[PDB]
Amino acid sequence: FVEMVDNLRGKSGQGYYVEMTVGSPPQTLNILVDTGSSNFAVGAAPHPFLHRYYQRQLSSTYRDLRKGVYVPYTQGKWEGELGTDLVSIPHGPNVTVRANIAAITESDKFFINGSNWEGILGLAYAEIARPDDSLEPFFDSLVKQTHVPNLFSLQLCGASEVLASVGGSMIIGGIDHSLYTGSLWYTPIRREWYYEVIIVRVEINGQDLKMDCKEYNYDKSIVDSGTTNLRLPKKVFEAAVKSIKAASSTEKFPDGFWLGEQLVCWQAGTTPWNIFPVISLYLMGEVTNQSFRITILPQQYLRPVEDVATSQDDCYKFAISQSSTGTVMGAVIMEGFYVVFDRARKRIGFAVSACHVHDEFRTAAVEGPFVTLDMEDCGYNIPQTDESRSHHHH
Ligand SMILES: O=C(OC1CCOCC1)[C@H]1C[C@]2(CN1)C(=O)Nc1ccccc12
Ligand SMILES: [Zn+2]
Ligand SMILES: [Zn+2]
């Protein structure tokens, strides 16, 4: 896995992306790595925001599936034409794989200006693939066609005329023990659609939020490398903020700051990290009544953004935001940790990352186990729609 290290790049807040080739001869493209979707989609038309796109007509190996796909997000939208071609990852494994590619022909608010990626690589499970679960996702194709273990791992590393560049590693097919310190800890994948986990306890600076633990997972908690922020359900969010406000109270910030809408700044290098509390999410363990905590620093949830005006200032954006769709453990969280997506054992691994950013007082941590007597169920059960209910899976 030597040759897989440092295979991710991107700009801060705009996504981590891996270099993939597709087609024959190999058309080379930067692709966003996104564990919260399950389609492989590539720009195949010209767009204002694309330097270069997938040209099917220039690939001998391309096969058209004569099917359309249409894929809305909450923010953003794209549609395209389904097909298959040869695909490989230069700084990934030394194989080539035939895989489904959605060729994107039109899109509203999908491609980001300056982000330098032209596709998305969803690494979640078939259930949430579009247009339905029979479109075999890339990673399924990869395992099915090669001897590559059903596992991958992500180390997303940290962040004045452009955004900051970011780096990381996507290790396909196992674990690289130079990427993490300390113990590696695993929570169950509750269910294979999203990388859904369960949170059992939340502490802000060692203080329990003291909420029914269902609230932490309403209506779901997921891990999404293609979300920047830590997203939390409204009730959890508001308590988080009350508590972060509390400890930060020496400092008085405009509404817009906490809404993720505005920047706050200090003199170059005088930023007072110590009035901001660590956050600790306890995740369900592999053993019943067991949990383990990941602790993340203010350095993670305050995101540095380089001001053009006062460039003699360090300025930060609050990267916790509100959700109506449950908890999303995005890049803000992952950036503390080597995260291991162990699909073979239906589990997610966390360890402290060999690269994670910290001050001299505190450190992001993975620390367990903890035990609760008669730990109730913290899972939510999403109301079943009749649409959903009427689907046949044969
Ligand atoms: O569907 C996703 O994330 C949602 C978020 C909340 O959790 C449920 C799943 C993928 C696709 C994504 C980010 N990750 C998205 O949504 N817009 C968007 C826009 C550009 C790139 C990637 C995405
Ligand atoms: Zn049927
Ligand atoms: Zn099905």
Residue 11 lies in a domain: no
Q: Are 302 and 165 found together in one domain?
A: yes
Residue after which a domain boundary falls, among 101, 119, 148: 148
Q: Whose CA is nearest to atom 12 of ligand 1?
A: 226
Resolution of the experimental model in angstroms, please? 2.5
Q: Are 39 and 170 found together in one domain?
A: no
- Which CATH number is 394's domain given? 2.40.70.10
Residues 150/172, Cβ–Cβ less than 8 Å:
no
* Ligand 1 centre distance from Cα of residue 107 (Å): 14
Using CA atoms, how far apart are residues 243 and 210, in angstroms rounded to an integer? 12
Residues 355/155, Cβ–Cβ less than 8 Å:
yes
Residue 300 lies in a domain: yes
Domain with 48 in it: 16-148
Using CA atoms, how far apart are residues 360 and 366, in angstroms rounded to an integer? 17
Q: Which residues line ligand 1 (CB under 6 A)?
A: 32, 34, 36-37, 73-76, 110, 120, 222, 224, 226-227, 325, 328
Q: Are 230 and 249 found together in one domain?
A: yes
* Ligand 2 centre distance from Cα of residue 202 (Å): 43
* Ligand 3 centre distance from Cα of residue 272 (Å): 52
Using CA atoms, how far apart are residues 114 and 231, in angstroms rounded to an integer? 24
Residue 6 lies in a domain: no
- What is the total count of domains within the chain? 2
Residue after which a domain boundary falls, among 148, 163, 197: 148
* Ligand 1 centre distance from Cα of residue 196 (Å): 15
Using CA atoms, how far apart are residues 303 and 335, in angstroms rounded to an integer? 11
Residue 275 lies in a domain: yes
Q: To test the ligand 1 pocket, which listed residue (14, 49, 74) has its Cβ within 8 A of the most ligand atoms?
A: 74
Q: Could you give the angle at the alpha carbon of 208 between the alpha carbons of 206 and 211, nearest 5°? A: 160
Q: Are 56 and 190 found together in one domain?
A: no
User: Is residue 140 flagged as an active site residue?
Assistant: no
Q: Is 287 exposed, middle or buried (0-12, 13-18, 19+ CB in 10 A)?
A: exposed
Q: In the numeric block, which tokens belong to residue 330? A: 């995005």
Using CA atoms, how far apart are residues 26 and 44, in angstroms rounded to an integer? 14
Q: Are 110 and 174 found together in one domain?
A: no
Residue bearing tokens 């097919």: 173
Residues 350/280, Cβ–Cβ less than 8 Å:
no
User: Is residue 313 flagged as an active site residue?
Assistant: no
Q: Are 133 and 223 found together in one domain?
A: no
Q: Whose CA is nearest to atom 13 of ligand 1?
A: 226
Q: Are 116 and 214 found together in one domain?
A: no
Using CA atoms, how far apart are residues 240 and 234, in angstroms rounded to an integer? 10
Q: Are 36 and 115 found together in one domain?
A: yes
Q: Are 209 and 333 found together in one domain?
A: yes
Q: Which residues pair with 389 in a beta bridge?
A: none
